[PDB]
Structures are given as C-alpha cells and as structure tokens.
C-alpha cells in the first residue's frame, strides 16, 4: 500500500543524509530585459545542484528496475521562464551528486510581466519524470539604475547574498564569477559563489560584529561564502567607471544597486584592490590619478547583483513511486493555538494537496486540507510523540523540552522535510 510506517520514518529521521534528495536552484533576483531581436543572457546563469547520497540510491532503484521492467538512468533537465512564447532550454549537465547551469536564458520585452520565475523539469533518460521545481521570483528590469521606490529588489541589504562577476570589453566569453573552491577564492566560468555581504562593525579577526542596513559606496564590507563560510578580509566597496575607481566625497551618498560595476579596496592600503588575473584572485596595486580617482584595469572591476535560492527536499521512503515527486509542498510557518487537548496547528505555505499528511516526528496525525496554502491538524500528546524508542531523538538535553521535526508525507510514501521543528515548550 506504500503507506509510511513509523519504523521507516524513524530510520529516515535518524539517517537523513543517506536518504534525502535535495534540489537547490540558484539565480539572481533581477533580470534585464531584451528588446527587439537581441538576447541579454541572465547572469549569473541560473543553476541547479542535486545534493545528497539519496540521488545515488534513486539511480540505483532506477537501475535495478530497468532490468526487471544502461544510460537510460541518466538525468535530463529543461528550464523555461513560465512563458508560452518562450523556448524551454535543455540544461547542460562531496555530497554534490550533479550540477547544471542555464547560460543562455533571456526575456523579451514582448513579455509584459513585472515578475517571473523559472521552472526546471527533471526526467530520467528513459522518459520517466521526476518533476518540476520553481525558482524564487525574479524582477524584470529595463537597465541598471542610475539614481543618486522598492529597495527589496534594487538595493543591497547587509546580510543578504550577492554574486560578483568580471567581464572584459563587453565580451560574453570572458565572463568569470568569484567562486570558492578548495578553501580558496578563485574565478570560474561555470560556477559562481553566492556570498553574504555584511556591514562590518568595528587589523582583523575570525570573529567580527555586523550591522543591518543598506550597503553604500565607501562602506566597509565582509564577503562570506555561503557554502564554506570562508571570508575575504575587510574591503571597502567603491564605484567604478571605465578602469577608474571614483573616490569622490559624493558617491558615498549613493547606495549600491543591481548590476553596478564596483571595486573592492583593502582597508590597510587604499591603493590595493581585489583583482582577477587568469581565474586567480589577487591583490593588485592601483596607480593614483588624484585624490578623487585611482587608475586600475578591467581586472579589478566587478559587477554585483543580488541572488536567491529555492530548495526542495524529498525521500521516497516506501520505495520508488509511479508519479512525479512534484509539486513539492513548501511550509512557510506553523501557527499554534490553545493548550492541552485543545491545542492545534495551522501550517502556512504553498503547493499543498489533499494527498499529504503531517507527521510530528514519527507520529502521523489526522490532517485537514483547507487550501493549497493551508493545512490544519491537532498537536498529538507528548506521550505519544516521544516514547522509549524515540526519546533520544526528540529530547533537548539542555532544557528538557520535547522538540520534533515536522514532515509532510504523501500517501505513496514520499516524505518532505519541512525545515521546521515543533517545540512543546510552545503551548
């Protein structure tokens, strides 16, 4: 019947890293539109990481059921921009199972939507569909801003993520992306880092304090790789024009905006900048023009843009399923009410279906489908959620509270970890 069992749920929750399949879609938060016949490619290229040993297990099941029912267990993917006049494009192809990037996506001006997202659809080479997964939303822009209003898309808040790229003399082929690989920064033509950009608070350290707020030119900034947590030293972000760094006592009035060109100066030496030489990241010393301006080269000039991420996790706990794994439910929040036997929870999120049941740890609970953004259930009593088998997993050893992860489970056995934990110290 393929219904999830408690024993199987317990094995999964204790061992997520060898079962759970992760699909992470990364992309910029804005795209410049194309007029006429032109194609202005999305940069950095939207990409997809398939993460987890679960992917290899999934291939194994597809391999072992290929011979009951060789390279028809190979991944095939497509991506498009949700438009019925836009071509779907074929995607390229540690715990990284596989990686693909879409390098030639664009949106024409004939497409009148203010926002769009990308739908990546995955298949096995034999025709078997895995499913369609959407990105976060992307705002269409006409061109980079030259202001001296919606800040959520145009400005860069401390704590958010950005991609940084180098391009020489308007040449697509020359594009290189700041990226960390092997515990060092470098520049790649296929991969790009999403870096957290922080306003430094106040000779340097591994531990530093940060500030909220928008990043302005002339701001001291810490860039931190979101994947490895490695950082660059403190850098002051500077506006650039045409191989010159503009140091004017007036650009500090200007907030850094999407698709602006900038330079990063070392805090110790005002003449030294972060610079790219043949995919190698270096310190390069500028030549002083005057007090308002420094001479650099196109190697020290970076375009900055805000990036986003859509992540989905699933496990086919009761064996390979006949239907697509998608639509993958997403849980944005839990809203709990009442105390004791009165206590209930509303799940808020997106892409719910009536074929889902909420599990508090390894305990399934009767679930009301209200809409695709609302599920409702009762909170099961502590005594039935934590027992002599599960005590070790659901007990906070510092405070003694009972904490259980919330999963959404489909009736054919696909478990979707929500990312959320229910604590009985609520209530």
């Amino acid at each position: 019947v393929q219904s999830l069992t408690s024993d199987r749920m317990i094995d999964f929750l204790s061992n997520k890293e060898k079962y759970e399949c992760v699909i992470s879609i990364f992309h910029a938060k804005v795209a410049q539109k194309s007029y006429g016949n032109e194609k202005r490619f999305f940069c950095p290229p939207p990409c997809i990481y398939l993460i987890g040993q679960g992917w290899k297990l999934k291939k194994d099941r597809v391999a072992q059921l290929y011979k009951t029912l060789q390279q028809a267990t190979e991944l095939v993917a497509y991506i498009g921009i949700g438009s019925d006049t836009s071509e779907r494009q074929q995607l390229d192809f540690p715990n990284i199972y596989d990686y693909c990037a879409a390098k030639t996506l664009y949106i024409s001006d004939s497409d009148k939507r203010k926002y769009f997202d990308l739908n990546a659809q995955f298949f096995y080479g034999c025709g078997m569909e895995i499913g369609g997964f959407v990105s976060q939303r992307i705002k269409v822009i006409s061109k980079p801003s030259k202001k001296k209003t919606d800040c959520k898309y145009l400005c860069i808040a401390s704590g958010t993520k950005v991609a940084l790229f180098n391009r020489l003399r308007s040449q697509t082929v020359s594009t290189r992306y700041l990226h960390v690989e092997g515990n060092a920064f470098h520049a790649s033509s296929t991969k790009w880092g999403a870096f957290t950009i922080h306003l430094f608070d106040d000779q340097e350290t591994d531990n530093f304090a940060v500030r909220d707020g928008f990043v302005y030119y002339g701001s001291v900034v810490k860039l931190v790789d979101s994947v490895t947590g490695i950082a660059l030293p403190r850098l002051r972000i500077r506006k650039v024009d045409k191989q010159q760094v503009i140091l004017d006592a007036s650009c500090s009035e200007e907030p850094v905006s999407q698709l602006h060109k900038c330079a990063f100066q070392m805090i110790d030496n005002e003449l030294v900048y972060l610079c790219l030489s043949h995919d190698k990241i270096i310190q390069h010393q500028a030549t002083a023009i005057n007090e308002h301006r420094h001479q650099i080269n196109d190697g020290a000039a970076w375009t900055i843009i805000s990036t986003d991420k859509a992540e989905y996790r699933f496990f086919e706990a009761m064996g390979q399923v006949a239907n697509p794994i998608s639509p993958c439910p997403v849980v944005g929040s839990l809203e709990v009410d009442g105390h004791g036997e009165a206590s209930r929870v509303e799940l808020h999120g997106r892409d719910f279906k009536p074929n889902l049941k909420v599990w508090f740890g390894a305990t399934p609970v009767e679930t009301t489908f209200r809409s695709e953004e609302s599920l409702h259930c009762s909170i099961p009593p502590v005594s039935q959620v934590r027992n002599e088998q599960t005590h070790w997993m659901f007990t906070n050893r510092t405070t003694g509270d009972v904490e259980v992860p919330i999963s959404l489970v489909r009736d054919d056995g696909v478990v979707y970890s929500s990312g959320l934990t229910f604590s009985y110290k609520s209530l």
Binding site: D206, N207, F208, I230, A231, L232, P233, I281, I282, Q285
Partner: peptide
C-alpha cells in the same frame, strides 16, 4: 548587531 565567525582567506600579493 550580530556576531559572525568566518576564517579569512588572504589574496596573494601580485609579484
């Protein structure tokens, strides 16, 4: 005002 911990990678000097 948060604290962050991140080991630093130093860009090698040019020559």
């Amino acid at each position: 005002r948060r604290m962050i911990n991140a080991s630093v990678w130093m860009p090698p000097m040019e020559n």
